[PDB]
Design a protein around this ligand. Structure first.
Ligand SMILES: [Mg+2]
Length: 267
């Protein structure tokens, strides 16, 4: 019934631009995808502020929440959440760091960089249905930080209902795949389920990371959408959409180095 997504948009850098995967070329395609596949609300990873402004401008009808992970204002990568303003209101929103001091910009446990989870308390403008939407990007080095981040996020899921026990959706780039201990940490308490396992219908012609290679295949999934067990998950899809650029013959290009994960859930 409603469509949610998780999409790592890939931080802008000159090195991509050089290889022909520049942000300026990708982002217009990303935005088209968001509009065509009708994402109602989606978590993004890796955007600098200027990337968020580009996307906001390409997406009339959408707004976003979430602060920079470096200083909690505008600096650094965001775990930004985009949403259609005609479908959802924000009741409350916030951000916490994946660390022992979640309230402030900080690194956690054995991680090498600061990591942020951003969240919204949303209300469906049509049906009044209310829910929590979380979105994060995990550390690549800190294995303990990833396991602890999972328990931390689940604690936050109990604290943030504003008085209710709200159902939760959690998107993100979890860095390691479904065979890891941090994945099991998310699903082991009965508090969240993997959309991939729970969906009525599953369309998955690939895993989620592609490395800007249009010919890659993996069974690994490092981008997940986890939902409270009370959600009906009607459909799960990996979108393998590609655009083309003139070679130096055209060649296939991925809009990001991940594929988006699209989930349809009943509200
Ligand atoms: Mg990346």
């Amino acid at each position: 019934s409603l469509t949610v997504a998780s999409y790592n948009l890939r931080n802008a850098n000159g090195s991509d631009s050089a290889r022909g995967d520049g942000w300026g070329q990708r982002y217009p395609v990303i935005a088209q995808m968001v509009q065509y596949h009708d994402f109602d609300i989606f978590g993004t990873q890796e955007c600098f502020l200027h990337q968020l402004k580009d996307m906001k401008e390409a997406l009339p009808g959408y707004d976003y929440i979430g602060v920079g992970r470096d200083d909690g204002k505008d600096k650094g990568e965001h775990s930004a959440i985009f949403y259609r303003t005609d479908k959802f209101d924000i009741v409350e929103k916030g951000d916490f760091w994946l660390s022992e001091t979640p309230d402030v910009p900080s690194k956690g446990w054995d991680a090498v960089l600061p990591r942020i989870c951003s969240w919204g308390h949303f209300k469906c403008k049509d049906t009044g249905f209310e829910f929590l939407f979380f979105n994060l990007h995990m550390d690549h080095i800190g294995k303990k930080a990833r396991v602890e981040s999972a328990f931390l996020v689940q604690e936050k899921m109990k604290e943030l209902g504003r008085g209710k026990n709200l159902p939760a959706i959690l998107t993100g780039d979890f860095n390691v795949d479904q065979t890891h201990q941090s994945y099991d940490a998310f699903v082991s308490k009965g508090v969240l389920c993997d959309s991939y396992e729970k969906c009525d219908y599953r369309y998955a012609l690939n895993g989620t990371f592609n490395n800007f290679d249009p010919n890659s295949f993996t069974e690994s999934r490092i981008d997940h959408i986890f939902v409270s067990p009370s959600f009906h998950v009607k459909r799960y899809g990996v979108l393998t959409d590609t655009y083309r650029s003139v070679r130096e013959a055209y060649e296939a290009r991925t809009p990001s180095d991940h594929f988006p994960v699209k989930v349809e859930l009943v509200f």
